[PDB]
Tab-separated table of C-alpha atoms and ligand atoms in Angstrom:
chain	number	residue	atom	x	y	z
A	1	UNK	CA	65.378	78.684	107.207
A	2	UNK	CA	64.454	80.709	104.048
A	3	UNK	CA	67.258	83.185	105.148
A	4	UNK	CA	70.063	83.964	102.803
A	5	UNK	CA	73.553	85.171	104.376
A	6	UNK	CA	74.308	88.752	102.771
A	7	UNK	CA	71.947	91.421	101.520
A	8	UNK	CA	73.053	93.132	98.543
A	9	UNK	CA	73.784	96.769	98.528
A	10	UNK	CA	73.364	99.099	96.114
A	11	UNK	CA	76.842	99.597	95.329
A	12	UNK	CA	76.733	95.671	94.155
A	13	UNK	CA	78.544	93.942	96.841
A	14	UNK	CA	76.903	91.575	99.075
A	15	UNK	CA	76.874	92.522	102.967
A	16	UNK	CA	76.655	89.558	105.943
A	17	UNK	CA	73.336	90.363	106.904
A	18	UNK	CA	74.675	89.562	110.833
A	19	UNK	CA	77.671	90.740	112.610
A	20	UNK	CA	79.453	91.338	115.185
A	21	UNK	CA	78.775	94.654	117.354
A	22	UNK	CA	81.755	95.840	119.482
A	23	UNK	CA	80.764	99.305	120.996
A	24	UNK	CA	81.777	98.360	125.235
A	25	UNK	CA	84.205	95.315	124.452
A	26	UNK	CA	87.044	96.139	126.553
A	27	UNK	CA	90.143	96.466	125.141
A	28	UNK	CA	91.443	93.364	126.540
A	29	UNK	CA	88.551	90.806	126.089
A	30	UNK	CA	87.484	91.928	121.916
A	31	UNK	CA	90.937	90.883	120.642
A	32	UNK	CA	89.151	87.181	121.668
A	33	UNK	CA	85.852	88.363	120.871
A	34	UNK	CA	86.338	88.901	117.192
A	35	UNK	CA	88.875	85.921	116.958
A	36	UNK	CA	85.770	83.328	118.270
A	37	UNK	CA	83.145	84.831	116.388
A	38	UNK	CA	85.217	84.729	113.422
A	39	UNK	CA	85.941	80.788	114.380
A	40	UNK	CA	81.812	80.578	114.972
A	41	UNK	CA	80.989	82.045	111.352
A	42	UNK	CA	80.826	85.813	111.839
A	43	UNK	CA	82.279	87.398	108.503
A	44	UNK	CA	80.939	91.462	109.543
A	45	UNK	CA	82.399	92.743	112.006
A	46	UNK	CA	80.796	96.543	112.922
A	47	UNK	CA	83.233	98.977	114.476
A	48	UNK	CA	84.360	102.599	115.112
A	49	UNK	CA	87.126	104.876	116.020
A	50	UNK	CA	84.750	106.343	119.088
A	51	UNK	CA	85.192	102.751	120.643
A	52	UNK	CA	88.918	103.137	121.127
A	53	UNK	CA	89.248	99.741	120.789
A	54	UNK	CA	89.991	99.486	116.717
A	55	UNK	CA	93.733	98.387	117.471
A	56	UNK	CA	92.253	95.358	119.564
A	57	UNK	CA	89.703	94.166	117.191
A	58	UNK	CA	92.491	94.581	114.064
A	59	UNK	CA	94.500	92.543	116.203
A	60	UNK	CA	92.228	89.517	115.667
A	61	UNK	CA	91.339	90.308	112.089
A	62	UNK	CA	94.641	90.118	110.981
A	63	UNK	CA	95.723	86.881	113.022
A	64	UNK	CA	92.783	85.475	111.249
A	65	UNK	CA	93.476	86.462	108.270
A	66	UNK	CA	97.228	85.043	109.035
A	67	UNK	CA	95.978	81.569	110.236
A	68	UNK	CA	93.426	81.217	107.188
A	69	UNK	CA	90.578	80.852	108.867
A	70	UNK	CA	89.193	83.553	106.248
A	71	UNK	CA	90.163	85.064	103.059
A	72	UNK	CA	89.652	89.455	103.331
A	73	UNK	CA	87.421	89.057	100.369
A	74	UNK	CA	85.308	87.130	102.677
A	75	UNK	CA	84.996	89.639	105.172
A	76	UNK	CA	82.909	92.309	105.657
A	77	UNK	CA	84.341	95.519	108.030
A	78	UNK	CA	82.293	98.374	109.294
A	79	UNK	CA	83.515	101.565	110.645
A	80	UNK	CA	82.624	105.118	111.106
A	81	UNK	CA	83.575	108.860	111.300
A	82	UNK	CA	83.269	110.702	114.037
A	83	UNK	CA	81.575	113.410	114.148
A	84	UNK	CA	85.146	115.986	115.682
A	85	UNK	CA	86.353	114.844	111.966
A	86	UNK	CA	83.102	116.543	109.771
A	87	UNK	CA	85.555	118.843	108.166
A	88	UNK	CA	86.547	118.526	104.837
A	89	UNK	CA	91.016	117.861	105.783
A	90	UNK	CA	89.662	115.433	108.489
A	91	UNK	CA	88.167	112.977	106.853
A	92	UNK	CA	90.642	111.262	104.897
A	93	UNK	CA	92.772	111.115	107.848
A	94	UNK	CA	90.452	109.824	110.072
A	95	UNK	CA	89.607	106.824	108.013
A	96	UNK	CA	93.431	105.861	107.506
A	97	UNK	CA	93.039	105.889	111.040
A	98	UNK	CA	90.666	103.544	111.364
A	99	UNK	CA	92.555	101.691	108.522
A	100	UNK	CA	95.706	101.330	110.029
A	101	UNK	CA	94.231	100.997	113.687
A	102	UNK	CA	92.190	97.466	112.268
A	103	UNK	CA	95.208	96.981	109.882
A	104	UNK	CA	93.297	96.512	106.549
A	105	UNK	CA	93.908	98.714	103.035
A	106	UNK	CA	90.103	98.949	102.690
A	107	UNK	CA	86.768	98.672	104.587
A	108	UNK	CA	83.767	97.268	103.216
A	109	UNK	CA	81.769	100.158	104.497
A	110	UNK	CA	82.605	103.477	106.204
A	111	UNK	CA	79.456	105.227	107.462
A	112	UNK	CA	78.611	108.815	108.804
A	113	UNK	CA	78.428	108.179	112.556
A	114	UNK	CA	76.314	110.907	113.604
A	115	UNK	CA	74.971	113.821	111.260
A	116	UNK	CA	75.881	116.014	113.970
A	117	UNK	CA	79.643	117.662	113.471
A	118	UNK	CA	81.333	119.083	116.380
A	119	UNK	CA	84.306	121.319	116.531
A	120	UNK	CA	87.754	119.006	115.815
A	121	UNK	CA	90.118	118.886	118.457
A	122	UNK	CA	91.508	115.781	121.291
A	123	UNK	CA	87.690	115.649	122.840
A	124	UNK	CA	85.072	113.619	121.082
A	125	UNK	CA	82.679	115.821	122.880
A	126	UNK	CA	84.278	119.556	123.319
A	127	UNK	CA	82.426	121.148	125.732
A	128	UNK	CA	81.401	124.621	126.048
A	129	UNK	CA	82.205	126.291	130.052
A	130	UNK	CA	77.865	125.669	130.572
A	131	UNK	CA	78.066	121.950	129.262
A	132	UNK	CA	76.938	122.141	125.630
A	133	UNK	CA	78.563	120.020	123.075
A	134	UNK	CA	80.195	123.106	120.493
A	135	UNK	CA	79.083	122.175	116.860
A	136	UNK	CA	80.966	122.363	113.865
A	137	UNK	CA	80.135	124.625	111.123
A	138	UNK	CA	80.135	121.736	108.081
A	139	UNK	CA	76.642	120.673	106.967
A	140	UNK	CA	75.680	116.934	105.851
A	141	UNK	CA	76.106	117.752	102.428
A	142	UNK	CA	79.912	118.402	101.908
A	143	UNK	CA	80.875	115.555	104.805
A	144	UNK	CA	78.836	113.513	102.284
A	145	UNK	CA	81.148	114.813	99.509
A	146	UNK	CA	84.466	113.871	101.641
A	147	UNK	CA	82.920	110.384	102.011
A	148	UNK	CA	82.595	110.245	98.020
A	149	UNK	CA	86.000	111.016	97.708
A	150	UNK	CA	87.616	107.765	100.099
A	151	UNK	CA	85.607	105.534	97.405
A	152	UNK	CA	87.360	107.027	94.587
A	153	UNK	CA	90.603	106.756	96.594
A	154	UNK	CA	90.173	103.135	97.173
A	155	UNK	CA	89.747	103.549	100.805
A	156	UNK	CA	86.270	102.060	101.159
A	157	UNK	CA	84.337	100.051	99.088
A	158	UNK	CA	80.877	101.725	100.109
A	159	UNK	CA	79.337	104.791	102.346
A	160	UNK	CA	76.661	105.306	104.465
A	161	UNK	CA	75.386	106.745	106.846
A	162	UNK	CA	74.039	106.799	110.937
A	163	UNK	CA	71.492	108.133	112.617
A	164	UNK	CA	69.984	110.111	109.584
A	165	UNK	CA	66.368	110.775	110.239
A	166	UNK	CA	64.325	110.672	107.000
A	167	UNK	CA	64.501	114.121	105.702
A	168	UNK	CA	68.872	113.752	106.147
A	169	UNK	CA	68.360	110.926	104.331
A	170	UNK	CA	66.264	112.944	102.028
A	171	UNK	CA	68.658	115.637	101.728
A	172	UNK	CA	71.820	113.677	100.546
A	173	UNK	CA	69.612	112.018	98.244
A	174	UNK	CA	68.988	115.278	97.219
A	175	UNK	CA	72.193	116.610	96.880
A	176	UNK	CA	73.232	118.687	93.766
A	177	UNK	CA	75.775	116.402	92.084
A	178	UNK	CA	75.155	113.335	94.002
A	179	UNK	CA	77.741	110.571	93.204
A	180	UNK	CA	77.257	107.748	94.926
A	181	UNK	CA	73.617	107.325	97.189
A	182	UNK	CA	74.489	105.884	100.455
A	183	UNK	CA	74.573	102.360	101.302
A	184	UNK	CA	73.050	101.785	104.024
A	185	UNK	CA	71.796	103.473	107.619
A	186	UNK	CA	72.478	102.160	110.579
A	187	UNK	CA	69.906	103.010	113.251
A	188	UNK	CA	68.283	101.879	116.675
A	189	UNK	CA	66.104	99.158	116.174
A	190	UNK	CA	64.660	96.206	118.156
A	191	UNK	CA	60.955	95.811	119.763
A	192	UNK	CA	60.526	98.828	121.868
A	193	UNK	CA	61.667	100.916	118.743
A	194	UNK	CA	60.233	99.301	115.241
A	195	UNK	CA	60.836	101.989	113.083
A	196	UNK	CA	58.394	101.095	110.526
A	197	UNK	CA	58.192	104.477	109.371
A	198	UNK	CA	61.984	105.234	108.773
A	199	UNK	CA	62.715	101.487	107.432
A	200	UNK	CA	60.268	101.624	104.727
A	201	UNK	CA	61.622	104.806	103.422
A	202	UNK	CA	65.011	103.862	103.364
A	203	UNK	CA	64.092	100.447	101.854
A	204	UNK	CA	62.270	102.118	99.284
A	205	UNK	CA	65.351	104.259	98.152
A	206	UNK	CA	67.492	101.180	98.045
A	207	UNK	CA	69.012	102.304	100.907
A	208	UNK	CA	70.083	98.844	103.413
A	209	UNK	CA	68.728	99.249	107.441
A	210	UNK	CA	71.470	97.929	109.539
A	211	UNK	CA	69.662	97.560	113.358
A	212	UNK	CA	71.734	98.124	116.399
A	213	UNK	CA	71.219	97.909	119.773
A	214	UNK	CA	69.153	94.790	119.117
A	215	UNK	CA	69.017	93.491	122.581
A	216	UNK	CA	68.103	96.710	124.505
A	217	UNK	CA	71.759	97.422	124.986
A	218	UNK	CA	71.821	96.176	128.623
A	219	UNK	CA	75.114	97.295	129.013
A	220	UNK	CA	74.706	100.860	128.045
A	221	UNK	CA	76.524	103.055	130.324
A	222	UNK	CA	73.147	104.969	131.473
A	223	UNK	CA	70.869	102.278	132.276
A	224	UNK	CA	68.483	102.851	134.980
A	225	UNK	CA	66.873	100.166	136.852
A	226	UNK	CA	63.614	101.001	135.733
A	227	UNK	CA	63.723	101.318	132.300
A	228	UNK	CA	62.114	98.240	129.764
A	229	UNK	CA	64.452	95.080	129.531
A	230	UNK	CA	64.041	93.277	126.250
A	231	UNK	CA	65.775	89.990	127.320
A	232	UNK	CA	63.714	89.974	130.529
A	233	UNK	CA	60.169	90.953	128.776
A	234	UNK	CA	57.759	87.510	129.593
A	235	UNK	CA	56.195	88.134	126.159
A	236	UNK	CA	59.177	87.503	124.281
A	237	UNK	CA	60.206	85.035	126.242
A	238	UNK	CA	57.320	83.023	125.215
A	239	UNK	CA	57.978	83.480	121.823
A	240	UNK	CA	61.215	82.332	122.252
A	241	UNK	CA	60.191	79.113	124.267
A	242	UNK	CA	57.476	78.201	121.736
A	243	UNK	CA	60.805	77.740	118.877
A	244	UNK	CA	62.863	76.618	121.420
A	245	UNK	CA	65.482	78.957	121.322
A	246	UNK	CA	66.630	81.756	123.420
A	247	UNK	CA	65.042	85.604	123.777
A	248	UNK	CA	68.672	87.000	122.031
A	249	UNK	CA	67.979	84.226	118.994
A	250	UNK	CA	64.393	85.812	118.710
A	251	UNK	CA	65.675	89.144	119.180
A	252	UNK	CA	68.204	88.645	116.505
A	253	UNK	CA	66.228	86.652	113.762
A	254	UNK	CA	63.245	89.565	114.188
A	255	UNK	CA	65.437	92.121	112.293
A	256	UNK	CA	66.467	89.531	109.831
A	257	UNK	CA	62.510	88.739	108.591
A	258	UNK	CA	62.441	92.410	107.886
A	259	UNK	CA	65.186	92.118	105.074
A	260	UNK	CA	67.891	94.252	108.176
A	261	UNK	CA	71.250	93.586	108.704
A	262	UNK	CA	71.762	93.026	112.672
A	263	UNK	CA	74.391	93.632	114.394
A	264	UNK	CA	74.493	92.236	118.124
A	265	UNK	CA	77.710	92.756	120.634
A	266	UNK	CA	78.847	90.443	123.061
A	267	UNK	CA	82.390	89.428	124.214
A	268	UNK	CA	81.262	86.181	126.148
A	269	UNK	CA	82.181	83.367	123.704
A	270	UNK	CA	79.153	81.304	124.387
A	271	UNK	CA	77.201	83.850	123.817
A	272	UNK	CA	78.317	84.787	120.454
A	273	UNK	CA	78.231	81.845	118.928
A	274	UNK	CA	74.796	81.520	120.218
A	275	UNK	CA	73.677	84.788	118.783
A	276	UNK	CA	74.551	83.073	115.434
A	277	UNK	CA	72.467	80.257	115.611
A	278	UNK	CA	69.628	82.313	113.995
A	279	UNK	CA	69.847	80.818	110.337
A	280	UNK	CA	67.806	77.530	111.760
A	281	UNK	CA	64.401	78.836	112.620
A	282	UNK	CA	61.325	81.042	111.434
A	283	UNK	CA	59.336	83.459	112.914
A	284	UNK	CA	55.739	83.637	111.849
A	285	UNK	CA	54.016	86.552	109.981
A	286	UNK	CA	52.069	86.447	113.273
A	287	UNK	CA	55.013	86.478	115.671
A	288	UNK	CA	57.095	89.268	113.776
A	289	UNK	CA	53.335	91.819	113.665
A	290	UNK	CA	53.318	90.435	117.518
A	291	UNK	CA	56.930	91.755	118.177
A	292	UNK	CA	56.217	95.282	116.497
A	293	UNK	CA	53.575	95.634	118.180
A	294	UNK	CA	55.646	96.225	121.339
A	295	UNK	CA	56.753	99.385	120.074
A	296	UNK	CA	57.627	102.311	122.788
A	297	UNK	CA	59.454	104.895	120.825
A	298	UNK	CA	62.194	103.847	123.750
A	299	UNK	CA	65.659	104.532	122.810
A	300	UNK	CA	69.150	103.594	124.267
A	301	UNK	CA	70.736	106.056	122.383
A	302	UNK	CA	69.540	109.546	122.557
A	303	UNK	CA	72.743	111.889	121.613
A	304	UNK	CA	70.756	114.047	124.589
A	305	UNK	CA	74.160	116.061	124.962
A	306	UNK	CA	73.376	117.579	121.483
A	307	UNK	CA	69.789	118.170	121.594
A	308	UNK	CA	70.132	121.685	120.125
A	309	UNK	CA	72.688	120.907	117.344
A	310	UNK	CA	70.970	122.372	114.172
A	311	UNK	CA	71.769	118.282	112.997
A	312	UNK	CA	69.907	116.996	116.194
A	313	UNK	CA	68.327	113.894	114.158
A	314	UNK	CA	65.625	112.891	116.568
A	315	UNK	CA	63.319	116.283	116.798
A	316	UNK	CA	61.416	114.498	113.713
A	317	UNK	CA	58.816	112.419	114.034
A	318	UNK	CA	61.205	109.601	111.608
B	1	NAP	N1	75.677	103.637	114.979
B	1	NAP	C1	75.515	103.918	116.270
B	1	NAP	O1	75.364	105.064	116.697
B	1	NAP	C2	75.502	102.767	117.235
B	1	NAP	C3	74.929	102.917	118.491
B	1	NAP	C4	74.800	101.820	119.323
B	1	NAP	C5	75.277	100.589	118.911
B	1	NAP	N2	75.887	100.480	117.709
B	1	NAP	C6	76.488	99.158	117.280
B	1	NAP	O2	75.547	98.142	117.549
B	1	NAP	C7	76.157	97.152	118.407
B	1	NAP	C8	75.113	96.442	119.225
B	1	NAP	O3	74.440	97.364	120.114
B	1	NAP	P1	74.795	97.487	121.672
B	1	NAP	O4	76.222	97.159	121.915
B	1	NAP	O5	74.297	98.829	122.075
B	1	NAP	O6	73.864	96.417	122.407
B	1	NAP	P2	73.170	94.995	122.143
B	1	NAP	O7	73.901	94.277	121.067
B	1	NAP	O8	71.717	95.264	122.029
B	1	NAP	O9	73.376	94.328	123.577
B	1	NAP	C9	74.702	94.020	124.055
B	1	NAP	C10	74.552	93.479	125.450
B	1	NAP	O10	73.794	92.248	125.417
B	1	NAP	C11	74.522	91.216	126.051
B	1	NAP	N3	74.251	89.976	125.344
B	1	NAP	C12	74.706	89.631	124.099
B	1	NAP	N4	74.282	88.467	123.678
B	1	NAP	C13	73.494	88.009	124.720
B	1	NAP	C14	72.793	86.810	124.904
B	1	NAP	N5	72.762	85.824	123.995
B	1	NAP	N6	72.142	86.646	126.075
B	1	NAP	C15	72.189	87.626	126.989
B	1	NAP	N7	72.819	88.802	126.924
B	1	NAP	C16	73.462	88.929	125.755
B	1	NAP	C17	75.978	91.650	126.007
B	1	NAP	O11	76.706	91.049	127.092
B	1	NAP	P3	78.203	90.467	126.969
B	1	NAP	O12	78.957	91.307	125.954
B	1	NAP	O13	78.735	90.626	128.395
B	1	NAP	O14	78.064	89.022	126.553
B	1	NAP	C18	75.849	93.160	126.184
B	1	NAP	O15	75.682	93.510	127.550
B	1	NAP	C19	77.199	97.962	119.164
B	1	NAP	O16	78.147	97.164	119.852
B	1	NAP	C20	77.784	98.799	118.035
B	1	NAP	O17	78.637	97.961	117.261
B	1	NAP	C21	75.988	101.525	116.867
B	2	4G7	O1	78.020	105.066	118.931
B	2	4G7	C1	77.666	104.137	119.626
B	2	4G7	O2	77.766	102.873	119.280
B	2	4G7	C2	77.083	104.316	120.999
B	2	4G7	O3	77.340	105.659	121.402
B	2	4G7	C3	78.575	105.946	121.929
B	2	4G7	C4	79.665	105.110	121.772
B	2	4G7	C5	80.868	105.530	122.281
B	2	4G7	F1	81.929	104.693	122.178
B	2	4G7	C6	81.040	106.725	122.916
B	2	4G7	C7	79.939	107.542	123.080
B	2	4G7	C8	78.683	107.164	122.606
B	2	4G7	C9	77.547	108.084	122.920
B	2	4G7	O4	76.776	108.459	122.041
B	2	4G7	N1	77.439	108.478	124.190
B	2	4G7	C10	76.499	109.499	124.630
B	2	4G7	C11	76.979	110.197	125.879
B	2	4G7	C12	76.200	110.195	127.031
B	2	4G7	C13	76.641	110.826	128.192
B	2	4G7	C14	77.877	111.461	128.193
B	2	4G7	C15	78.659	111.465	127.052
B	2	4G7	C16	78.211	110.838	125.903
């Protein structure tokens, strides 16, 4: 379908250019999750220790890898620091962490979750007594520095970053002594949020755009019933009808035909090895210009309990 598997990053491995999104998969039901879509073709799998599930989804990475299904040099693991562990001493901990928690001696990727740092402690968000989320005092720059170091430890094969608006982006590319650019940001992306202006930038730097929440997120814990539904929307509907798949397929395969990495959750098996089934269709030049132009600026994620941290990525315009 003119659609190659992996993207190649600019730390020369090759990244599955879908995977498997696990942010809400309870505990008890991603253990199965991971071990279908693994069964179904899924070789990414995007994760992170703020999803306290990283035990459950190791559990069926490993029994995979046990049974033979896949070889770990065919898989492609995602994770990310949170941001109570910005500090210098907190990193390195954090991603063994992660390691041990998905049982693997290396991830493909570890990204910045947030450029927002908060002070370290039990709480992922430590609250002042009037409700504000207390910051940490480390910058972008030296967290970026930490991450350098876990690829010269042989922790993780690449770094990135999350949620980096285009001057953080800017400013690690900037950084005095820069050792390795990052990899790849992973951002909000699907029609109601096109983000022409931030992809091309990061494109243009080498930089890989891995889009999440590519449904809408329908299961984000602060839907309201009035907000837009992306699965629902007639427009895209139609779209999907006319190539005879479903909205999710479109709504998947649209990120792909902009050279992004997508990364779609679901724990219903059905579902995700539907959401696969993307590799066996095209979208028009005229369908993909139709989709972005259902742009909103809407956003599932928001970080609105941090609007005034100094890192706040989404005062910019991109
Ligand atoms: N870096 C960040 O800050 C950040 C933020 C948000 C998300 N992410 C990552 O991106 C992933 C994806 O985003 P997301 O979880 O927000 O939402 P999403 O992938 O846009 O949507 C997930 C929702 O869609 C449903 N769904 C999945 N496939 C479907 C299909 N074929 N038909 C109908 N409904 C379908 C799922 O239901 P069921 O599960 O019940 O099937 C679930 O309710 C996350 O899981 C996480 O890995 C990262
Ligand atoms: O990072 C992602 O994939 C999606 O964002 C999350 C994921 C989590 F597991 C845990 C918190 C978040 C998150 O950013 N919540 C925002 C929020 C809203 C209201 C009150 C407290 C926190």
């Amino acid at each position: 379908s003119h659609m190659a598997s992996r993207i190649l990053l600019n730390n020369g491995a090759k990244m599955p250019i879908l995977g498997l999104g696990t942010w809400k998969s309870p505990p008890g039901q991603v253990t199965e999750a991971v071990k279908v879509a693994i069964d179904v073709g899924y070789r990414h799998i995007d994760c992170a220790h703020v999803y306290q599930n990283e035990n459950e989804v190791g559990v069926a990475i490993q029994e995979k890898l046990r049974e033979q299904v896949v070889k770990r040099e065919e898989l492609f693991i995602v994770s990310k620091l949170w941001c109570t562990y910005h500090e210098k001493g907190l990193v390195k901990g954090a991603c063994q962490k992660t390691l041990s928690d998905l049982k693997l001696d290396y991830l493909d990727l570890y990204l910045i979750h947030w450029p927002t740092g908060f002070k370290p402690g039990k709480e992922f968000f430590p609250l002042d007594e009037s409700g504000n989320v207390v910051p940490s005092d480390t910058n972008i720059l030296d967290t970026w520095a930490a991450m350098e170091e876990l690829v010269d430890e042989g922790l993780v094969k690449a770094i990135g970053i999350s949620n980096f608006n285009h001057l953080q982006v800017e400013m690690i590319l900037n950084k005095p002594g820069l050792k390795y650019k990052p990899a790849v940001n992973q951002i909000e992306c699907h029609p109601y949020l096109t983000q022409e202006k931030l992809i091309q930038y990061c494109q243009s730097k080498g930089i890989v755009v891995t889009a999440y929440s590519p449904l809408g997120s329908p299961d984000r814990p602060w839907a309201k019933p009035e907000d837009p539904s992306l699965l629902e929307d007639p427009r895209i509907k139609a779209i999907a009808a006319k190539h005879n798949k479903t909205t999710a397929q479109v709504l998947i395969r649209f990120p792909m035909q902009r050279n992004l990495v997508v990364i779609p959750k679901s724990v219903t098996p059905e579902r995700i090895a539907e959401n696969f089934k993307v590799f066996d269709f095209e979208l028009s030049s005229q369908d993909m210009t139709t989709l972005l132009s259902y742009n909103r600026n809407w956003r599932v994620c928001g970080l609105l309990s941090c609007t005034s941290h100094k890192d706040y990525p989404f005062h910019e315009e991109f």
